[PDB]
Amino acid sequence: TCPFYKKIPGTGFTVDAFQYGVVEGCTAYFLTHFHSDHYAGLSKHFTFPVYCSEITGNLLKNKLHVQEQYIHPLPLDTECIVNGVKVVLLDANHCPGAVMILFYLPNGTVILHTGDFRADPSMERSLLADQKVHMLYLDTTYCSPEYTFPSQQEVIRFAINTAFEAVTLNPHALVVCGTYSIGKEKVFLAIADVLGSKVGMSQEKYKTLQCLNIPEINSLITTDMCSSLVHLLPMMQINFKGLQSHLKKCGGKYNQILAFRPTGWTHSNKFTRIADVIPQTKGNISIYGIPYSEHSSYLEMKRFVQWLKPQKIIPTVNVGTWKSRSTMEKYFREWKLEAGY
Ligand code: NI
């Protein structure tokens, strides 16, 4: 049974609610982005209208085989009528194709559903500038002040400089980057660009990347692993055992691996600066954990909400414990008292 925080009152609509069977009263299922916790339940046998971005719709058709007649892609930044209700899709600054949804209810209420997002000051000059929001369904993944991390640009500067130094010292070093979902593609694209290489990967991952509308992608990626000195591997293989095994497979072309695991936050964030990050090393294998987030930090979240001034907040993450729920409600009240709304 579908939880209340996935339902949009006064409509026939749900958000990210595909794992509950046929939801009573739902005439249109929205999907914010192609991450498995959110698409869970979709397949080629789904027969209700799915509303989403163009990029999400490419992934639903090619990767999950949803039939075309049920996929309804909408352009971004554009007023659209769906089943008699005005909606707008906005870029969420999450993974490729990820959106926030603005719903203009028939009674005058305006609702923003952030899906998963990384708040940014640029959102203060989107179509959100133009009117009031009564209800905010908020991605609260990192809603506590201990969650700090650097900008995505500082993290990519660290990765490029680290990889370029290592491979210039040793032209026989291989770079490996972990992946288990879409998102974070700048990590491996930026490193391959500094090295003058295409990124090598499995056929299944190449297929996924070909759905993402990235400009000039054919110039940047390949399935020919041997021609490439940046390889992508499943995240589970980014450990000393998995990397040793991979180095065997390259037929003595390489004699060193430098590997990256983009995680979200880890508690080494509460003590270490990005500049001071060091790898774990064993022999000719080194592994860096780099804090590349596609979710808001605490401070970015707080800035967004204090600017938007919603009348009510409904968290969509960390909702399963009473301690989490009470913590989040306390910070919402602080923010509202400090700003005066
Ligand atoms: Ni996500």
UniProtKB/Swiss-Prot annotation:
Localization, UniProt: Nucleus
Tissues showing expression: Expressed in brain, heart, kidney, liver, pancreas, placenta and skeletal muscle.
Induction of its expression: During mitosis. The mRNA encoding this protein contains an internal ribosome entry site (IRES) in its 5'-UTR. This 5'-UTR generally suppresses translation while specifically promoting expression during mitosis, when cap-dependent translation may be impaired.
Function: May be required for DNA interstrand cross-link repair. Also required for checkpoint mediated cell cycle arrest in early prophase in response to mitotic spindle poisons. Possesses beta-lactamase activity, catalyzing the hydrolysis of penicillin G and nitrocefin. Exhibits no activity towards other beta-lactam antibiotic classes including cephalosporins (cefotaxime) and carbapenems (imipenem).
Record note on quaternary structure: Binds constitutively to TP53BP1. Binds CDC27, which is itself a component of the anaphase promoting complex (APC). Binds PIAS1.
Family stated for the protein in its record: Belongs to the DNA repair metallo-beta-lactamase (DRMBL) family.
Protein name: DNA cross-link repair 1A protein
Originating species: Homo sapiens
